């Protein structure tokens, strides 16, 4: 009898779907968590100056290891066992 | 309008949530909502919103 013109979720006229009591509680629970999130970030242990290059050898070593692993890309060795192992196809019981 | 804004017993207010970018709400809000504090929507002004 009463229709929502066009699509019911887009356009100038939409569905009057209201906010429920359960939805309000979900927002509050996330807000309480985020209120705690921005408190533990408030007071750093070290200042900006005291952390200047505190861990740079490890960063340099990590990048060097990345170069070393990526530079080892090369075709694998080829051995006689792989080629001579094909003759075992016609192995028989004499 | 100031006494009702000072004695409000609700910990969360539109000014606090929008400015601090809580819940990633800036994706939904407009940049003008930082100044409007949620009291203005389009050309409509609701004086009862704190």
């Amino acid at each position: 009898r009463n229709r929502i013109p066009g699509r019911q979720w887009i356009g100038k006229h939409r569905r009057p779907r209201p906010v429920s009591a359960q939805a309000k509680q979900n927002m509050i629970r996330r807000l309480e968590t985020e209120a705690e999130n921005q408190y533990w970030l408030s007071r750093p242990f070290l200042t900006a100056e005291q952390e200047r290059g505190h861990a740079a050898v490890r960063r340099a070593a990590a990048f060097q290891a990345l170069k070393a692993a990526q530079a080892a890309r090369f075709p694998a060795h080829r051995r006689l066992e792989e080629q001579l192992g094909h003759l075992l196809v016609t192995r028989k019981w004499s | 309008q100031e006494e009702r804004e000072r004695n409000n017993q609700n910990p969360w207010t539109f000014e606090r949530i929008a400015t601090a970018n809580m819940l990633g709400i800036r994706k939904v809000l407009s940049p003008y909502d930082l100044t409007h504090k949620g009291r203005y929507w389009g050309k409509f002004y609701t004086p009862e919103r704190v």
Binding site: K12, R14, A23 | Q9, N10, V28, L29, G42
Partner: peptide, 29 residues
């Protein structure tokens, strides 16, 4: 889509409606 300012109380995004309902004013009791 409609302009930023309209004449028909532009319907808010559903996430924004929850924001407008959780940031209400509670008078002291």
């Amino acid at each position: 889509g409609s302009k930023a300012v309209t004449r028909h109380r532009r319907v808010m995004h559903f996430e924004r409606q929850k924001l407008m309902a959780v940031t209400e004013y509670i008078p002291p009791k």
